[PDB]
Amino acid sequence: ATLKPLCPILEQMSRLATSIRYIDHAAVLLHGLASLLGLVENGVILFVVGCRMRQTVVTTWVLHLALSDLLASASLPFFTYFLAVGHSWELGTTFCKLHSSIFFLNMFASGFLLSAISLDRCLQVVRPVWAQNHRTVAAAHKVCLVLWALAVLNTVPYFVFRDTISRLDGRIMCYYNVLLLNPGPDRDATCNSRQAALAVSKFLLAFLVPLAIIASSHAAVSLRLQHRADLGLQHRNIFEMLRIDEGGGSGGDEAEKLFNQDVDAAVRGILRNAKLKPVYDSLDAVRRAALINMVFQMGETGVAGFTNSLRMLQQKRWDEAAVNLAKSRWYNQTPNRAKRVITTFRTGTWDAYRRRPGRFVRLVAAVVAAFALCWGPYHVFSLLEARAHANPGLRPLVWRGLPFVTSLAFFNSVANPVLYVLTCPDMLRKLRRSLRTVLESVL
Numbered sequence: 052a053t054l055k056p057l058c059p060i061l062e063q064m065s066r067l068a069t070s071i072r073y074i075d076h077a078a079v080l081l082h083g084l085a086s087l088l089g090l091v092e093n094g095v096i097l098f099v100v101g102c103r104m105r106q107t108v109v110t111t112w113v114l115h116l117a118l119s120d121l122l123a124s125a126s127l128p129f130f131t132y133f134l135a136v137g138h139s140w141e142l143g144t145t146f147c148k149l150h151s152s153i154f155f156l157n158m159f160a161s162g163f164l165l166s167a168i169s170l171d172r173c174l175q176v177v178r179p180v181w182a183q184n185h186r187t188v189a190a191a192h193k194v195c196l197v198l199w200a201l202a203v204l205n206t207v208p209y210f211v212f213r214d215t216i217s218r219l220d221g222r223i224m225c226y227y228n229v230l231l232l233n234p235g236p237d238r239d240a241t242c243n244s245r246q247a248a249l250a251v252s253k254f255l256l257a258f259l260v261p262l263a264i265i266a267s268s269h270a271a272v273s274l275r276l277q278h279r280a281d282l283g284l285q286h287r288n289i290f291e292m293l294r295i296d297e298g299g300g301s302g303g304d305e306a307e308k309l310f311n312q313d314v315d316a317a318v319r320g321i322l323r324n325a326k327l328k329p330v331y332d333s334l335d336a337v338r339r340a341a342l343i344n345m346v347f348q349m350g351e352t353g354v355a356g357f358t359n360s361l362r363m364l365q366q367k368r369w370d371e372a373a374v375n376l377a378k379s380r381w382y383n384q385t386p387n388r389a390k391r392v393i394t395t396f397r398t399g400t401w402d403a404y405r406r407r408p409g410r411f412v413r414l415v416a417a418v419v420a421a422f423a424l425c426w427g428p429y430h431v432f433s434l435l436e437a438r439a440h441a442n443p444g445l446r447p448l449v450w451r452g453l454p455f456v457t458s459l460a461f462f463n464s465v466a467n468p469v470l471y472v473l474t475c476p477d478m479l480r481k482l483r484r485s486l487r488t489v490l491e492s493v494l
């Protein structure tokens with residue numbers, strides 16, 4: 052036989068005269084239905100958004116946001132089995148680590164994605180010139196891959212410090228064991244230090260900091276839109292295009308700004324090139340603005356690569372240039388930012404990017420609301436559990452609330468897909484269409 056040293060928080064939990072267990076069937080059914088609903092709801096969401104819906108940047112955020120919830124409701128039926136046998140983990144040690152990791156993986160992922168969403172909207176409003184030339188779908192996909200890697204990285208310690216602990220009544224707990232690996236000379240000290248180190252860091256990186264970014268990005272937008280509304284109602288600013296001085300301040304540090312919008316710098320480069328300058332002189336003010344965007348999107352070298360297209364613009368053969376530009380890799384990989392430039396060359400009319408209002412606003416505000424209401428109460432008790440190492444009086448209070456608010460965060464994965472439909476008419480329409488098509492196939 053063996054013997055492991057445990058933290059005082061655990062030892063009391065390991066001591067609460069019979070092998071017979073009482074089964075709360077109500078919780079079994081409650082978590083049972085939540086498993087099926089959670090899998091089916093997020094299941095059809097991924098299909099509707101990903102297969103039968105036009106792919107943009109915002110729908111990419113939601114797509115990954117529905118993927119983490121799918122994994123979250125995949126671990127749920129194993130937790131139902133846990134309750135079915137009277138609160139006991141009977142599926143080995145390695146499966147205990149993996150099952151627990153999913154909960155934390157979904158936690159960090161959801162907190163990072165809600166941050167990315169708020170920042171994507173912020174860049175769209177605060178820096179219009181940059182956004183229209185770089186906010187592509189492929190970039191949105193690339194960002195998510197980084198976020199998941201950081202999500203996995205932050206769930207590494209929780210995988211390590213999970214362990215199965217035998218009780219005195221026969222049950223087997225699956226919970227924290229901060230002494231499992233590399234315990235210091237002082238067990239009591241390292242029990243408290245690394246426990247608070249987990250509760251505090253998880254509270255900041257995955258909740259408080261997301262909420263801070265969300266609220267901070269929300270205030271920047273509302274003020275920027277108010278200023279823009281005042282500019283639009285001015286007679287002078289009627290046909291103005293590619294503005295920068297909306298944020299105020301001087302215009303001397305334009306070459307040093309992140310998410311750059313230095314329009315003047317590109318113009319000097321255009322005149323420096325022997326290929327682009329005579330073409331630039333041929334075009335009118337509107338078609339010059341579209342040429343600058345091309346320089347912004349692929350650089351001077353790439354724009355000078357379209358020989359036949361430049362020759363067509365210089366002779367004012369617009370429709371002929373439009374046909375040529377449409378058969379390129381530039382238009383094939385990023386159609387949205389490309390179609391806007393090509394059409395400008397055709398019509399000779401400018402289409403304002405800052406005219407287009409944001410989408411999925413009702414969706415994000417609803418998911419955030421559910422996010423703060425489900426993970427809110429959880430972190431409150433989690434921080435108290437770390438505090439309960441020095442104060443013994445808080446311990447019975449933790450044993451009551453923590454099992455509930457944990458299941459509350461669990462049910463967050465079941466709430467979101469319902470909220471997706473109620474705040475997005477396009478989603479609901481596309482769903483009833485698929486539903487009707489499916490039912491018609493049988494008849």
Ligand SMILES: CN([C@@H]1CCc2c(c3ccccc3n2CC(=O)O)C1)S(=O)(=O)c1ccc(F)cc1
Nearest residue numbers: 138150151154224225226433449450453454457
């Ligand atoms: C009910 N059991 C755990 C409660 C807390 C908890 C569990 C769990 C499983 C996966 C992911 C997270 C989980 N949490 C919350 C957390 O890890 O912070 C099961 S229990 O009987 O072992 C238990 C009951 C009361 C308690 F205070 C601690 C553990």
Ligand SMILES: CCCCCCCC/C=C\CCCCCCCC(=O)O
Nearest residue numbers: 094095097098101102111114115192
């Ligand atoms: C296993 C059961 C659940 C399966 C439901 C349907 C799965 C298919 C979902 C969409 C697949 C194609 C997605 C294409 C968009 C890629 C966007 C991205 O992930 O960056």
Ligand SMILES: CCCCCCCC/C=C\CCCCCCCC(=O)O
Nearest residue numbers: 416417420421424425462463465466
């Ligand atoms: C499965 C149980 C989990 C449910 C947790 C609660 C989820 C819903 C949270 C609050 C949603 C409120 C939405 C706020 C926007 C209201 C829409 C409006 O009036 O414009």
